[PDB]
Amino acid sequence: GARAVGAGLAEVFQLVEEAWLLPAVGREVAQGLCDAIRLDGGLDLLLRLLQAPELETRVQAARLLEQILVAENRDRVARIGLGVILNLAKEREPVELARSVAGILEHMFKHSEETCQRLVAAGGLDAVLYWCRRTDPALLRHCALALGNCALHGGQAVQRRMVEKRAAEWLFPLAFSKEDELLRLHACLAVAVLATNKEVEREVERSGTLALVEPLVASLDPGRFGPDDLQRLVPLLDSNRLEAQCIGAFYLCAEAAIKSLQGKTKVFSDIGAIQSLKRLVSYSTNGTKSALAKRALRLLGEEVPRPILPSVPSWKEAEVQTWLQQIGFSKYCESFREQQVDGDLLLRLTEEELQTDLGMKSGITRKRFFRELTELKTFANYSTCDRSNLADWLGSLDPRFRQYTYGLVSCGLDRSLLHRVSEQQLLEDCGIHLGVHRARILTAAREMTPDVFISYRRNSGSQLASLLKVHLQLHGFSVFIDVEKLEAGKFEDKLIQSVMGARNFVLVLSPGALDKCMQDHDCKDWVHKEIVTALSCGKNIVPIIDGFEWPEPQVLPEDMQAVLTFNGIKWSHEYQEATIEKIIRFLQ
Amino acid sequence: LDGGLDLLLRLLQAPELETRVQAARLLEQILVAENRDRVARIGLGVILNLAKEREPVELARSVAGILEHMFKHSEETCQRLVAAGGLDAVLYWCRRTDPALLRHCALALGNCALHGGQAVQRRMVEKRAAEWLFPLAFSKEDELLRLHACLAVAVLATNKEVEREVERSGTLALVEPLVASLDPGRFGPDDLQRLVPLLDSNRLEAQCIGAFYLCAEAAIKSLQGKTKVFSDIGAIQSLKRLVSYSTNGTKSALAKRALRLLGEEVPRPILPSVPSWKEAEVQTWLQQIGFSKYCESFREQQVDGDLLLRLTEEELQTDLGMKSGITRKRFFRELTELKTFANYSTCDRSNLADWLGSLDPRFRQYTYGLVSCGLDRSLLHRVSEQQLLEDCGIHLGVHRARILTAAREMTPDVFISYRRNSGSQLASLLKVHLQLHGFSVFIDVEKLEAGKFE
């Protein structure tokens, strides 16, 4: 298309790129071209400049290198990308080119796995995790997507290492930051991805940054805004999770609402995200994800008829036909209607009936079918039949057991009369084909307040509260925070109980934090309520000041006058290792 | 539609309870799907209204109606309302006297039970929803309120995990002398797919409500019916079965007239004594259970009333034509629903049927099998699983095991007398309060309204 000049080259002082040597032409250009001159543009000299002394030229060349905007450039740096890591390690000083090197990493993980392993092993994660501690509206938006890449690109050998290094914890503050909603999206995507290898879901949930995804995507709008993210997002809305299915659906409605302004309706036909969206709508018990998926699927086409009724044991021919529509078996919708397949002739179905009558000759198709039948028998509402509530006794062994509930209650078996069943009876009658499930069912049938609380300004002190929470959680203290639940929790109860139950109370005093709380002599402001309840126990309240002038007691109402009597510990955005260890002795 | 906006939520959140009342009165008209969705997205001000507004200030008539209109949404709404003090308000305002507030609380509870799945029905009953729903059923005025309470109790008594507790309440049986009196001329989105499981139940107190509500919604269907919606929900076939094996008159009259409104009344409630049918009776039954197509074969093989209680899968597979094993799973569903209804008196000498139906009411179907082989109460402690499987035809191994096991081993605290037209309202509340306070209570109209005899 259009053409860019061959800019002159000096190699004299590197001052010639003080404006990056070509701003707003092929780089920082926003025209109808959209193509970077990065191909054949730039060479090895940048690596040398980063390797060089005189940190000013290091900063300039790193700023330039933040535009690894093509495949071959990433390959070529990966061939020699160790000067990057030396830049990381030696450059951890708060000198503010972290905005550049962290962005290099962000752009660099998206390469093959081996790059991610060598970076993570050789102090690569150390930099991004350490710079998720610094305050900047654009550096953090680099670290967040860096971690999201390292988790989404890299396989399990690096996800496990990330989580060992507490990636989810250090990724919490990025999610819980009032400003930069795109930063919250880029942090919650990373946590959702990390919570999709089952070996880690325990630790990610221990972190506390996972649930916060739900009251983040429930509010924002697909009008908000990684190569082939789609084949790497579909495993986010195939998960058995809510905090990850919501992100998968939101990102996919975003990347289907900005697909050439009009979609493409073929890329999703290859990745097969539309079918998984259909079964995300159908068996969905939620509104958030079932609305995001609904509008995304409408953007693509053919919204599913219903979120099908939860009570299978009492469907009829009609409901079953509608379900067969919803699960790709529309072709067989005739035979399941020529045989009057009721809602029991679909939960007491087996392979011989399918093999002969219904036409499903291909054993693969009856393996797919029973995959869907198991994803529906674990969703069903066995209330019209399950007298003794066997389903909860099954789904409490292995959530894949619940599918057998109907088998075990179409034969009278209940909680009482189950200690007298034997493997032959289970196999022939209850239809529990897998010998391992039979063995586990017989075995299980035969044998039969957080440490500290941070109350804070919900508009300015949130940023400091996030870091305090994650620092102290990595220091062995359990912490509760307000917005882990909601933002509208103005009502009195459901959180004060922990406030007196808290073993400590650290208050983030940001400047002007008392503007809304002042003149609220009614104590209507419910953080002013929290400040009032701070003095309830005298439970070692340790205020943390941040540039907030320490106000005089007389202007301050007596319900919170005595709070300032306790000393306020200075907080420095730098050297937080020292401040936290200063704070630990004030905790107990 | 596009009428009204978020400002109402702000007004509810506002002080000056008079404007709260006005805006809540307006918000009682969530009359479209999208409005329910949009409030459900932010419907917490409703719950704060519920909690802070528990004071008898008489806008409960408004907020309770909001809830009534609000449960009908998906399950998650019902769970979040019930958990966050939502049921607390409706159960608290089934304690206040008003001819229109109660007609809101009753239908609210009926929605919460009927819409919401088992996770919320169990919670409702844990909170004693059936007890607090008794007074609404037993209130002499507002017959529509009695209907809207008995529908809710009938729905709650259709998940077997709860039928015990609902029967413990005492508000269940009161449904029978409530629908036997009133008339389909008396008067929930797609209630029908959620009503059919009320007349598929193994209950009388719930089949009567299912049949009455369905004859109502078939007597006011566009002034003339539709005779296609019921053909898709499949309520007509279940109505035919409700008539046929019915032992009662109430439900078998409601179902009869509803089915007449729709079409093709059943030939009769078939004779209760199967062991002595002939070709003709069997053919009539095959008519009544959708097997009309196979009738010819059951008449080409002179299928008597033992050649229908001693039938098995090879005889059906070869002769009678039913090749499709699905259809012979349906057929044995119907054969079991008839062998549990039959009158084994001409054959069952030692009354084995009562010894079986006292283990699992699904056993009674085996009675004929066990008395076409001489087995009786005495000579049953000497039978063994091989004999049961081959001769008695007790296919399911679990049923064989249970039959062998069971064969080898072998005044209320307070009384309220009252005026039957003025003191009934107070008597209901006293009964439910004291039952929730650990006192058993008997009341008059739990039996009848004409019990003048001594």
Contacts 24+ apart (CB under 8 A), A391-399: A394/A441, A397/A440, A397/A441, A397/A444, A398/A437, A398/A440, A399/A240
Q: Which of A336, A408, A411, A522 to mutate to test the interface with B (most CBs of B within 10 A)?
A: A411
Q: How far is CA A320 from the centre of its chain?
A: 35
The DSSP string of A183-201 is: HHHHHHHHHHHHTTSHHHH
First-to-last alpha carbon distance for chain A, in angstroms, is: 67
Residue B442 tokens, joined = 């008997």
A5 min Cα distance to partner chain B (Å): 54
**CA distance, residue A83 to nearest chain B CA (Å):** 51
Which residues are paired to A23 by β-bridges?
Answer: A27
Chain B contact for A387 (CB, 8 A cutoff)? yes
Q: Which domain holds residue A572?
A: 449-588
Alpha helices, DSSP H, located in B227-278: 229-233, 235-244, 250-262
Does B327 sit within 8 Å of A340, measured CB to CB?
A: yes
A91 is in an annotated binding site: no
Identity at A221, one-letter amino acid code: D
Token code pair at residue A365: 């198709």
Residue B77 CB partners (closer than 8 Å, separation 6+)? A287, B40, B43, B70, B71
d(CA B365, CA B33): 47
- Tally C-beta pairs within 8 A across A and B: 101
Residue A524 phi, psi dihedral angles, 5° rounding: -70, -45
3-state secondary structure of B125: helix
R_g (Cα) of chain A, nearest Å: 29
Measure the CA dihedral A41/A44/A46/A47, to 10°.
150
CA distance A335 to chain B (A): 11
A541 known member of a binding site: no
B158/chain A closest Cα distance in angstroms: 6
Contacts of A307 in chain B (CB under 8 A): 74
Give long-range contacts, CB 8 A cutoff, 24+ apart: A550-554: A551/A514
* Backbone torsions φ then ψ of A452, nearest 5 degrees: -130, 155
Quick one: A338 exposed, middle or buried, by C-beta within 10 A (0-12, 13-18, 19+)?
middle
In the block, tokens 């009908």 appear at B72
Q: Which of B233, B326, B398 sits opposite A421 (nearest CB)?
A: B398
* N-to-C CA span, chain B: 60
Collect all residues of chain A within an 8 Å Cβ-Cβ radius of residue B160.
383-387
Kindly list the residues from chain B whose CB atom is less than 8 angstroms away from the CB atom of residue A342.
Answer: 330
Interacting residues of A331 by C-beta distance below 8 A, sequence separation 6+: none
Entry resolution in angstroms? 3.4
Distance of CA A404 to the CA centre of its chain: 32
Assigned token pair, A361? 């000759």
Question: Does A429 sit within 8 Å of B398, measured CB to CB?
Answer: yes
Q: How many CB atoms lie within 10 A of CB B222?
A: 6
Looking at the DSSP bridge assignments, the partners of residue A455 are A507
For B401, the closest of A307, A341, A425 (CB atoms) is A425
Q: Residue B372 corresponds to which tokens in the numbers above?
A: 């076409």
Q: How far is CA A77 from the centre of its chain?
A: 30
Report yes or no: A411 and B396 within 8 Å, Cβ to Cβ.
yes
| 3-state SS track over A353-406 | HHHHCCCCCCCCHHHHHHHHHHHHHCCCCCCCCCCCCHHHHHCCCCCCCHHHHH
Instruction: Say yes or no: A314 contacts chain B, CB-CB below 8 A.
Output: yes
Q: Contact B160/A384 with Cβ under 8 angstroms?
A: yes
Token couple for B69: 């209109």
* CA dist., res. A333 & res. A358, Å (int): 10
Report the relative pairing of strands A569-570 and A452-456 from DSSP bridges.
unpaired
Q: Is A69 annotated in some ligand binding site?
A: yes
Distances (CA, A) of A414 to A184, A270, A387, A403, A549: 48, 45, 7, 15, 67
Residue A137 CA: distances (Å) to CA of A92, A174, A391, A555, B259: 18, 10, 49, 35, 70
Q: Characterise A154 by phi-psi region: left (phi > 0), alpha (psi -120 to 50), beta (else).
A: left
Q: Are A416 and A431 in contact (CB under 8 A)?
A: no
- In A297-339 the beta strands, taken as DSSP E runs, fall at none
Q: What angle do CA B118, B119, B122 make, to 5 degrees?
A: 75
* Rg of chain B over all Cα atoms, to the nearest angstrom: 26
Q: What angle do CA B91, B92, B95 make, to 5 degrees?
A: 100
**Cβ-contact A417, A430 below 8 angstroms:** no
Residues 26-85 of B with CB under 8 A from A: 37, 40-41, 44, 48, 51, 74-77
Cβ pair B271, B281 in contact under 8 A: yes
CB contact under 8 A, A345 and B362: no
Q: How far is A222 from chain B (nearest CA, A)?
A: 16
In single-letter form, the type of residue at position B358 comes to S
Q: Which of B353, B361, B308 lies closest to B331, judged by CA?
A: B308
Using DSSP's 3-state secondary structure scheme, residue A242 falls into helix
Burial B139-152 (b: 16+ CB within 10 A, else e): bbebeebbbbbbbb
CB B133 within 8 A of CB B109: yes
Q: Which residues pair with A507 in a beta bridge?
A: A455
Phi-psi sector, A193: left (phi>0), alpha (psi -120 to 50), beta: alpha
Contact state of A309 with B402 under an 8 Å Cβ cutoff = no
Whole-number Å distance between alpha carbons of A485 and A133: 23
A453 DSSP β-pair partners: A480, A505
For the beta carbon of residue B451, count every other beta carbon within 10 angstroms.
9
Best CA proximity match to B392, nearest among B355, B358, B362, B365: B365
Alpha helices in B28-96 (DSSP H): 33-42, 45-52, 60-71, 75-83, 87-93
- A301 CB-contact burial (10 Å; exposed 0-12 / middle 13-18 / buried 19+): exposed
Any idea which residues of A carry the catalytic annotation?
530
Q: Within the 241-280 window of chain A, which residues sit less than 8 Å (CB to CB) from chain B?
A: none
Which of B326, B360, B389 is the best residue to mutate to test the A interface, defined by the most A CB atoms within 10 Å of its own CB? B326
Residues 6+ apart with CB under 8 A from A206: none
A75-82 long-range contacts, CB within 8 A, separation 24+: A75/A111, A77/A47, A77/A108, A78/A108, A78/A111, A78/A112, A78/A115, A80/A44, A80/A47, A81/A108, A81/A115, A82/A122
Chain B interface test: which of A351, A408, A429, A492 (most B C-beta within 10 Å): A429
Cβ within 8 Å, pair B397-A348: no
Answer whether A412 sits within 8 Å of B325, measured CB to CB: no
3-state secondary structure of A228: coil
Query: What strands, in cross-sheet order, belong to the sheet with A452-456?
Result: A479-481, A452-456, A504-509, A544-545, A569-570
Tokens 């400047």 appear where? A511
CA distance B359 to B399: 10
**Closest by CA position to A109, among listed A147, A82, A71, A83:** A147
Q: Please say whether the beta carbons of B286 and B298 come within 8 A.
A: yes
Q: B278: which 2 tokens?
A: 């002939």
CB contact under 8 A, A417 and B396: no
Tokens representing residue B226 in the block: 């539709």
- Separation CA A24–CA A306 (nearest Å): 51
Technique that determined the structure: cryo-EM
Question: Are A159 and A197 a contacting pair, CB within 8 Å?
Answer: yes
What gap in Å lies between CA A573 and CA A132, rounded to an integer? Answer: 12
Q: What's the full length of chain A, in residues?
A: 588
Residue B137: which of B122, B153, B123 has the closest Cα? Answer: B153
In whole angstroms, what is the distance from residue A92 CA to residue A141 CA?
Answer: 18
**CA–CA dist A161, B16 (Å, integer):** 57
The distance from CA B407 to its chain's CA centroid, rounded to whole angstroms, is 33
CA distances from A417 to A109, B358, B359, B402 (A): 57, 15, 11, 9
Amino acid found at A413: L
User: In the structure encoding, which two tokens stand for residue A565, read together?
Assistant: 């009597």
Strand partners for A509: A545
Q: Using the beta-carbon criterion (under 8 Å), do B397 and A425 form an inter-chain contact?
A: yes
Q: Please report residues of B whose CB lies closer than 8 A to that of A524.
A: none
